[PDB]
Amino acid sequence: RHKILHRLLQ
Amino acid sequence: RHKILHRLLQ
Amino acid sequence: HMLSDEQMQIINSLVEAHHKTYDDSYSDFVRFRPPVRLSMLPHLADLVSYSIQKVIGFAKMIPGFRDLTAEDQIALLKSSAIEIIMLRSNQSFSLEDMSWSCGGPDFKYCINDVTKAGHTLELLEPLVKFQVGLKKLKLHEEEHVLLMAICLLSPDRPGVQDHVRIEALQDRLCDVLQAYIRIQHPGGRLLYAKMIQKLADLRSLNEEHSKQYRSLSFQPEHSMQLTPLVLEVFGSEV
Amino acid sequence: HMLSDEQMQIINSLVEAHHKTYDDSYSDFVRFRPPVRLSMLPHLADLVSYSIQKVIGFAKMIPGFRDLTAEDQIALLKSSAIEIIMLRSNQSFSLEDMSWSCGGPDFKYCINDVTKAGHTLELLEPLVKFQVGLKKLKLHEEEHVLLMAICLLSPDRPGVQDHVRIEALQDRLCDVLQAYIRIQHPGGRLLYAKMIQKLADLRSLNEEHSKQYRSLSFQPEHSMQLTPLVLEVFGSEV
Numbered sequence A, B: 001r002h003k004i005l006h007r008l009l010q
Numbered sequence C, D: 001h002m003l004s005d006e007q008m009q010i011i012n013s014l015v016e017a018h019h020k021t022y023d024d025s026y027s028d029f030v031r032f033r034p035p036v037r038l039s040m041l042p043h044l045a046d047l048v049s050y051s052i053q054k055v056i057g058f059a060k061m062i063p064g065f066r067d068l069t070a071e072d073q074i075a076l077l078k079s080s081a082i083e084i085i086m087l088r089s090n091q092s093f094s095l096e097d098m099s100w101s102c103g104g105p106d107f108k109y110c111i112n113d114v115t116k117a118g119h120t121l122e123l124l125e126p127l128v129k130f131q132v133g134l135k136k137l138k139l140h141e142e143e144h145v146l147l148m149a150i151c152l153l154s155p156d157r158p159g160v161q162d163h164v165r166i167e168a169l170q171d172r173l174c175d176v177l178q179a180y181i182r183i184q185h186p187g188g189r190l191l192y193a194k195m196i197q198k199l200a201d202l203r204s205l206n207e208e209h210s211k212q213y214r215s216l217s218f219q220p221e222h223s224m225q226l227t228p229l230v231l232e233v234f235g236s237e238v
């Protein structure tokens, strides 16, 4: 999962 | 699911 | 005619429930993430999340709600919540400046404020038009609180199971309103119809909000600014 | 000896990364849910969530990190995050009043403050003892920032896949530190060892925090006060 971490990692 | 709603509904 | 003792009780427990879940001072808003002029998203998410809890405490005190299965209670709440919020928020809405005023200038939200929280005019315009009409109906406390419980106990929601029991509840409540108005409200022989229509407006409004929230929640940079409860209630898990 | 151009560069890009992800004015803290004296849980959740984002921006600028697989980057971040936070938070820690001071009296957190956010003395006591020891090592900026990147690039984390590549990275970095100290730090021939031990302390600290957060997050009344990012990072999804 980790939707937010993926985004924040651009 | 709904962990929070279950609690808030005591 | 005059209302029965049972009807009278229903009104009483409903108005009490409203007072216990609505703080007319809005003093708790200083505990939200501050308003900023999507700069307004953190504060309004904090505002809605707060209201959802109040809407839950309200529903818990509606006669009969507590006696439904948890599944159904969650189902009714997940789909009516934003409508109760729009409904209850009429109390802070002001016609003189066309905005929700909540104890100060920082806590005064116009359309432009909510536009900085990720919503479009497509929602906010019919919403304000809604709040004005509703404001103009000059509802009694008893009527306002009834209308909200009616909205909560709508059986035509996705997910309900005992639609038979929930319909019985809603009708019982509608009789109380239809009755109350007849007896206790002078010059309101179209009012019941006007309130029923207000319900139909809320469904449209629910739909537009759901479209926009879905847009908003699908972007992680924005959904991370939401709250676990908001995400639970407005999210689509079965 | 003297450092190579490559080593020198590493130091440079690391210190730059630190400055870009650490605001010495703490002015952004006024955007958190206010501190209240579990009254402190909303503010500290907002604080940690903020720091996690900064820790992420920092890691993104570590040479080599960006070139790992996302899986590994998430794995390193999910397990080292609180340690980087404890590490970076030394910059605000003060020996004179034994607390983290962040621009004001409202943003000054002692042990008693964090106890009102759902943590016990079992964590907070070794933590303060940790922060003092670390404070007493009087690290250079270069050393402080190195130590954090070393901690991030630990290959002995649950979930890492290319432990070979990550170990290479960490060693490269340790050489830079071991070297830097030798050359640029007078009177620190035990320091490297002292810093390495500081890493071992952080693991204990990580464990205690994880126990307590697990306790905290298992109660919905409390976890609802946390943030989506906190929940993601400190949560246990694979």
Ligand SMILES: C=C1/C(=C\C=C2/CCC[C@@]3(C)[C@H]2CC[C@]3(C)C#CC#CC(O)(C(F)(F)F)C(F)(F)F)C[C@@H](O)C[C@@H]1O
Pocket: C041, C044, C045, C047, C048, C049, C051, C085, C086, C088, C089, C090, C091, C092, C093, C100, C102, C109, C114, C117, C118, C119, C127, C212, C213, C216, C226, C230, C234
């Ligand atoms: C909520 C109340 C009051 C004002 C209400 C107001 C004035 C502010 C804007 C509100 C909140 C409006 C009613 C509905 C509306 C236009 C909205 C929204 C939204 C949204 C979100 O999508 C967002 F943006 F991400 F936050 C969601 F779902 F995450 F929350 C103030 C008091 O009357 C209490 C009452 O309980």
Ligand SMILES: C=C1/C(=C\C=C2/CCC[C@@]3(C)[C@H]2CC[C@]3(C)C#CC#CC(O)(C(F)(F)F)C(F)(F)F)C[C@@H](O)C[C@@H]1O
Pocket: D041, D044, D045, D047, D048, D049, D051, D085, D086, D088, D089, D090, D091, D092, D093, D100, D102, D109, D114, D117, D118, D119, D127, D212, D213, D216, D226, D230, D234
């Ligand atoms: C975080 C920083 C600073 C102070 C740090 C401080 C001072 C306040 C307490 C902190 C946060 C401490 C470092 C770690 C500790 C004892 C903690 C914690 C916690 C926790 C939670 O379980 C809780 F409680 F639910 F919020 C979690 F996971 F949800 F966040 C201030 C600046 O140096 C920036 C730095 O980036």
